[PDB]
Amino acid sequence: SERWYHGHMSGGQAETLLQAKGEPWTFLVRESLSQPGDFVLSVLSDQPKAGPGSPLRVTHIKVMCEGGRYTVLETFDSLTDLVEHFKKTGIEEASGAFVYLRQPYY
Amino acid sequence: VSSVPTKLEVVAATPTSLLISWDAPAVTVDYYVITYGETGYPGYQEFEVPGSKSTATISGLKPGVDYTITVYAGFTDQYYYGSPISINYRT
Questions:
Q1: Cα separation, B59 vs B50, whole angstroms
Q2: Domain residues for A46?
Q3: What's the domain count of chain A?
Q4: Nearest C-alpha of chain A: how many angstroms from B39?
Q5: d(CA A8, CA B39)
Q6: Interface membership of B48 toward A (CB under 8 Å)
Q7: What is the domain extent for residue B10?
Q8: Å from B33 to nearest chain A CA?
Q9: What is the count of structural domains for chain B?
Q10: Phi, psi for B23 (deg, rounded to 5)
Q11: Which residues pair with B45 in a beta bridge?
């Protein structure tokens, strides 16, 4: 519940980290460098960025945090309870586009 | 933080792509960060751009969809990015 968290890490470094270890639905949590106090769910999709062989598309999801609650709707006591909940069914990253949390990036 | 990119326009668009241009803020910028995603949804894509560049091309969008395009100033000095400017464009 803490080893998928990587703290102060940029979105581009997450992408590099997840694309190299290139298995779909590999995720990690990092704090947002755009909004302090919030966090970002960085997930490696199964969709290639371009043609065959190209790296897989990395998707970032804002997770807002105020009043000690966490939300991406419903809220959660901790980042763990958030990650645990969306691991079941996924996150609708865009209209009809879902990402899934299968493998944590340690 | 006030020193935020002062304008952000779509200079040319195809149904699946955009060519955005911003104007540099008053302060020297090391790099710009740009996010984009569908308005109302929590997912976004991200890519960085050297501080000498004021235009970027966003590709792979779905036609007739409102996307939210955001630019941040990046400084090696600062822990966090600068204040953002963001627009909404329909492909």
A1: 18
A2: 1-106
A3: 1
A4: 9
A5: 26
A6: yes
A7: 1-91
A8: 9
A9: 1
A10: -105, 130
A11: B36
